[PDB]
Amino acid sequence: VDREEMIERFANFLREYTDEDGNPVYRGKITDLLTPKRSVAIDWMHLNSFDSELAHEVIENPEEGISAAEDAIQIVLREDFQREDVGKIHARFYNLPETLMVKDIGAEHINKLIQVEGIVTRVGEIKPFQSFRIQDRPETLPRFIDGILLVALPGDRVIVTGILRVVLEKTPIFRKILEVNHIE
């Protein structure tokens, strides 16, 4: 619900979630940061099985939900591993409950964390960002959306999560783009 509560609840999830074998998956993903990875990829269905309220909040209030998850990673690093100097670690959510085709993206998807399937038709770089043009896959027929990431090459089929942002496109319009939270 509120920010402080979400942080505490993410820390509990990271510490206490276990897979079908009783293994604390997210403890391992945290120790991967001490060798290193600079993200923790979180399976949303793991989160939903543990804390369905928190998982719903990630979808409906992504800016706050993602930020809280990141602050929880820092808390666990400090308290459980005595590390405070790893720097910013991104929380990257995948396996959301609904998947959109690019053509399905609408007004109802603003201000949410969304999951989109497509085929990559372009990949570019304008430092420090990577960009992807994500188009409807031919076997679903095309519309496209550009994604910005801070993994995939032209021709690759992908599933991405992210939040809709805009770019001023020069008649000028604010074209919807996706700020990418996770891609595979």
Residue numbers in the entry: 1 to 35, 38 to 130, 182 to 194, 200 to 208, 214 to 233, 237 to 250
Publication excerpt:
The Minichromosome Maintenance (MCM) complex forms an essential hexameric-ring helicase that unwinds DNA at the replication fork (1–3). MCM proteins have three conserved domains: an N-terminal domain (MCMN) that mediates the head-to-head interaction of the initial double-hexamer; a conserved AAA+ ATPase domain; and a short helix-turn-helix domain at the C-terminus. Crystal structures of the N-terminal domains of Methanobacterium thermautotrophicus (MtMCMN), Sulfolobus solfataricus (SsoMCMN) and Pyrococcus furiosis (PfMCMN) show a consistent hexameric ring structure with three subdomains: a helical subdomain-A, a Zn-binding subdomain-B and an OB-fold subdomain-C. The crystal structure of PfMCMN bound to single-stranded DNA (ssDNA) revealed that subdomain-C binds ssDNA in the plane of the hexameric ring via conserved residues defined as the MCM single-stranded DNA-binding motif (MSSB).
We designed the PfMCMN-ΔZFD construct to disrupt the short intersubunit antiparallel β-sheet interaction (P130 carbonyl–F240 amide and V132 amide–P238 carbonyl). Because these interactions exclusively involve main-chain atoms, they cannot be predictably disrupted by side-chain mutagenesis. This deletion removes the V132 amide altogether and requires a different orientation for the P130 carbonyl to accommodate the tight β-hairpin needed to accommodate the deletion. We confirmed that the deletion indeed removed the potential for the short intersubunit β-sheet interaction by determining its crystal structure to 1.55 Å resolution. The structure shows that P130 adopts a cis-proline conformation in order to generate the tight β-hairpin of the deletion, and thus the carbonyl of this residue is no longer available to interact with a neighboring subunit. Notably, the MSSB residues of PfMCMN-ΔZFD are positioned very similar to those of PfMCMN-WT when bound to ssDNA. The PfMCMN-ΔZFD and PfMCMN-F179A mutants are exclusively monomeric at all concentrations tested. All of these mutants (PfMCMN-ΔZFD, PfMCMN-F179A and PfMCMN-βT) have wild-type MSSB motifs available for interaction with ssDNA, but no binding is observed.
